[PDB]
Design a protein around this ligand. Sequence first.
Ligand SMILES: [Ca+2]
Ligand SMILES: [Ca+2]
Ligand SMILES: [Ca+2]
Ligand SMILES: [Ca+2]
Lengths: 291, 315, 291, 315, 85
Amino acid sequence: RGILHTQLVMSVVGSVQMRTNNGKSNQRFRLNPSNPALFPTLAYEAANYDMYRLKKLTLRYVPLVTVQNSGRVAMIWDPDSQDSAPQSRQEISAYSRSVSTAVYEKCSLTIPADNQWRFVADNTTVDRKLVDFGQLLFVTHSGSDGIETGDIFLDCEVEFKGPQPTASIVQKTVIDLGGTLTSFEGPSYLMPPDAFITSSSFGLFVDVAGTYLLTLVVTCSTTGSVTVGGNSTLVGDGRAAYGSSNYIASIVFTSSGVLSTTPSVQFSGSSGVSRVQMNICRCKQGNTFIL
Amino acid sequence: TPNTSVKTVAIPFAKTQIIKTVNPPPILHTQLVMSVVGSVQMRTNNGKSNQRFRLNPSNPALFPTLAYEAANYDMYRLKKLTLRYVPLVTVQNSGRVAMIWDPDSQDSAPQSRQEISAYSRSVSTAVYEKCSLTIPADNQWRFVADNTTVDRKLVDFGQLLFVTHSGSDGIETGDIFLDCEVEFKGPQPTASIVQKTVIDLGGTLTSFEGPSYLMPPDAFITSSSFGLFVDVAGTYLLTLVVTCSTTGSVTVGGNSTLVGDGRAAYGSSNYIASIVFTSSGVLSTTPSVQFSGSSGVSRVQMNICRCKQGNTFIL
Amino acid sequence: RGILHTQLVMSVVGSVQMRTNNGKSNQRFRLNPSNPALFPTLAYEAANYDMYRLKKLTLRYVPLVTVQNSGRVAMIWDPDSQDSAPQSRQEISAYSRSVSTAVYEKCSLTIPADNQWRFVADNTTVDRKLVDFGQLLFVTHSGSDGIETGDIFLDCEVEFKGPQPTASIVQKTVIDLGGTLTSFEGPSYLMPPDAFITSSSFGLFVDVAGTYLLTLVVTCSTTGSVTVGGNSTLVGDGRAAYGSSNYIASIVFTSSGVLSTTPSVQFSGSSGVSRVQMNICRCKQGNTFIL
Amino acid sequence: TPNTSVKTVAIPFAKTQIIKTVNPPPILHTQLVMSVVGSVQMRTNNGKSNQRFRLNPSNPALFPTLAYEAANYDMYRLKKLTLRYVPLVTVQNSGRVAMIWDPDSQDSAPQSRQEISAYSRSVSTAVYEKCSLTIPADNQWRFVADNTTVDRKLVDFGQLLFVTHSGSDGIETGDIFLDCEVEFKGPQPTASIVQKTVIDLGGTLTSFEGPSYLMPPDAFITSSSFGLFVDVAGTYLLTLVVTCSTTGSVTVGGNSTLVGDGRAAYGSSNYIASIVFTSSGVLSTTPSVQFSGSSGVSRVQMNICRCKQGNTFIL
Amino acid sequence: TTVDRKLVDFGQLLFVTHSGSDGIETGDIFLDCEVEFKGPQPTASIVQKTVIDLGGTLTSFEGPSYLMPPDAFITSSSFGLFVDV
Ligand SMILES: [Ca+2]
Ligand SMILES: [Ca+2]
Ligand SMILES: [Ca+2]
Ligand SMILES: [Ca+2]
């Protein structure tokens, strides 16, 4: 028999109007084990292999808030991985596997598994449709806007066929003025609508809920302070440096996955930001820098 | 069969539990462990050390009564293990309490929201609603921790971690109970139930002679001051022996109060006191026993005994 | 068959930190019928006899507060009557008969009785251990500090062997400067840590929850007013007098047994208090003094 | 069998009860008695007299309908007696309501917390939670109270006391219901259902001719004023006959309102009025019927009849 | 510690020798028990507290019975204990 793995997926933040996978597109919750959002602990095993096959899948929304904040969390599975995110509130019952209850009460949803071996995404494939097992979509619509409602767990029995040299679990992203985040050599901790640069400032929203390690490489002309807040606190040893036209810093912070209308990591005060290069690693608290 | 099943849930109001003892024979044994103090940001074992709850019968936090019977034996098992968080609050206060068991006894604690859910064996419901966690047992015999070993991983059975976040700040939310059937194999004469802990400048606590009342992230020394954060909740008996150059005063902080006849004395380079205090184990950001006002503190040596309110000295 | 007697024992006041029998030592709840705390109505029958034997014993914590104040009331029986009060929170499960639930919910605890005749305490015995049936200990530890949580009832079937001329149910206590309450010729309405005198003032805390009658005899040099508040209200006819160096007053008040950080009966404004002599009787409301 | 039994209690939210009548025959009989007004300090029968609820069928407080049928008989029993406090409030308001039955009918009331619990037969739960008290019956036949006796201890079956404290101040907390199977032995012609009460200066009410609408701690006279605290909650018909020297006015206070055509007159040393008021029985610290402004009041004589809103005089 | 420890203990052992064979390891005494215990405490404080005044003897507090009152002597200038356990 296999081994179950309970894994944290989201911290569900409620909404008033209508909202999909909360701040993000219909790209986040792909059913591949090469996805840090749905698989925070199996992505390290998924870097060693190229074929997977799912056996048991349950979603387990567990509430956290007091029973005073009305809401409706829905959990939806697609067989596609390229269908668009749902548009209305009432385009929810038209899916195949769906559980939609109130915010304050726990749920469950079982997903029937196939028997086909599928590729583990270390790419840059064009068709995600034939690779993934499907999407997971999470919808909130009543109210109780800025409140951590609950959190969604996920249980798996994943087996892997033929191995591989390890896919490098360190991102590498580049921003230009007017550009977006563009990943390089994987994985997908950051999605492209997660950052912004100006002529003087810089910011990153991080919602995967881990403890990470940055290496800022920012091309500016003056120095700038680096503040960490909103979703994440410093494991406070953030040592930066200046020199030539580069700006180099290294940060250890612990995000919490919750949305906020403040960037998690923010760089301000400088002038003429042109490029920002990143590396994120998912480290632990012992990887700080002694003053 | 209509493909959508509407199920109704009636969330009533405050759920509580009522606990009676019988007790009968000359063995399940429920005990309190903590009172869960909710916090806003993120917190482990609620301000206590990163190593505190630790499955030996020679551990004062989990077994304040069995630790005396554990001194007369060497081997132990643990048969039945349940953790039975009981709420004390209505459905009005938000928050989350999680109960975690490690198979290690030397890991650290989260230090994230990521690590709370999938540890291996964890129950993470809300504050106002009851939990129940069971731990599967083994059949191995392990040493009772005497004459303290270093790698206490092959000795203990594991940790308990008790993580809360996103409260409901510092309120009596609930309390955690613990059940055991402990059996003991071949006996000792006894074990010395008096700690001996030593601090140097820049160092931490290093315990000798056992048991584990104080743990190394509980004390701090400076060139002129000294402090202990006793978080075990008993009534104790100290003997401060502090290598100073001047005299000083000893006050009793927030976690504890005197039985107010603490007699101390100065003399040679040593400074010797003897205090009887009663601690509560709740957090407070004051040292529970504080010695300040002196100069050139280098060593502090301790003896702690768990004595009642008649072992105080008399003016 | 016998006759049951439901009797009020405490008004349980919650606590934040850790607290035994709330303001008092491990002397209060001795299992003798010569104890006004555990036996407010059988102490009048216990003054006539010298041997007792208990038959049925139940404790019946009945709550009073709304279910918003978290707490933990514990009720503990000892077979000793000279063991010390428990030290920690977690030295509760190590007793023999114990029920510990939340503040807002009722409990029950039955105590198995013996068959030995034991002496009724009209003394000044050294060993209470062989006389009493045991202790009762009451512990509160979460929070909800200054709140009347509930009250503990107690049921008995007590039979008495050979009679006696009546033990005088009027206390007599003396305080000196720097001294404490020292009782004389019984009973035990007041315990020694229940009073304080200064060079100018005087106070008594009364937590047995009855209606009483004082005779203050205070040796001062000037007069002083007598205020009653905190736990008890005047049945308001308090007539005092002055004269020579004595100060004599007579008060009828009704305590409620609840703790408060104000003395129940307080005497202030005078100068050179040296001795205070008392007599307490447990009277009724008709024993006042007409103006 | 593990010596510690964890039992879970789910305290839901507001519990209520729903009461319907059927009624069928040409006999259990539920009635309201009070609406429990919680108080902060300590209070008996909620501001009413120390003697009010009193087990005769000739008592308007407990039997506003049977008192007319009780006039046609002499003996009575009481077979079934339940008291069934129904809450009207959520689990948010603290407090305590106790329900007490005495075998005496002439004792006083507490006047402490000591006397509430162990009276003989008492239920003392919280405000938000339901109670139920049953009273065991006898087989004796007792006189219906006519042509008022003095020692009404051998006549009545007992008292009801209804003590609240530590509220939740003056809020509609709950209400108290009362069930009876009353049977009557040999009949009278009738009984005169009109009180006659007389007050002198310094004295109290002394009732004649029955029944017990007003009770002696309900009225006060001065040299110049007069007041009644009617706490029975009906619609009545007064005839004030006050021995004065001057005229005066009559107002209707807080417990009651006019049917506003109260016609009075002066004349000789008497002063004669005739009022129709409708009282509610709730406390208020104003006299419900007040006569003030006169001089040298010596006697006040009364007649009260329980008349409906058509027995008012006309301007 | 109670005072009248007669209703508490089960008795004494006395172990009298005479007319020796002076201070020689002669023999040794063994003791057998089946002890059973009824209802439990938290613990008992296993640390003595004994106090001597001038002219007085040992008066023990807080238990157990390591030292007993004919074991110590004080003077104006000296002090001694005969620990025999
Ligand atoms: Ca590959
Ligand atoms: Ca580990
Ligand atoms: Ca006697
Ligand atoms: Ca009576």
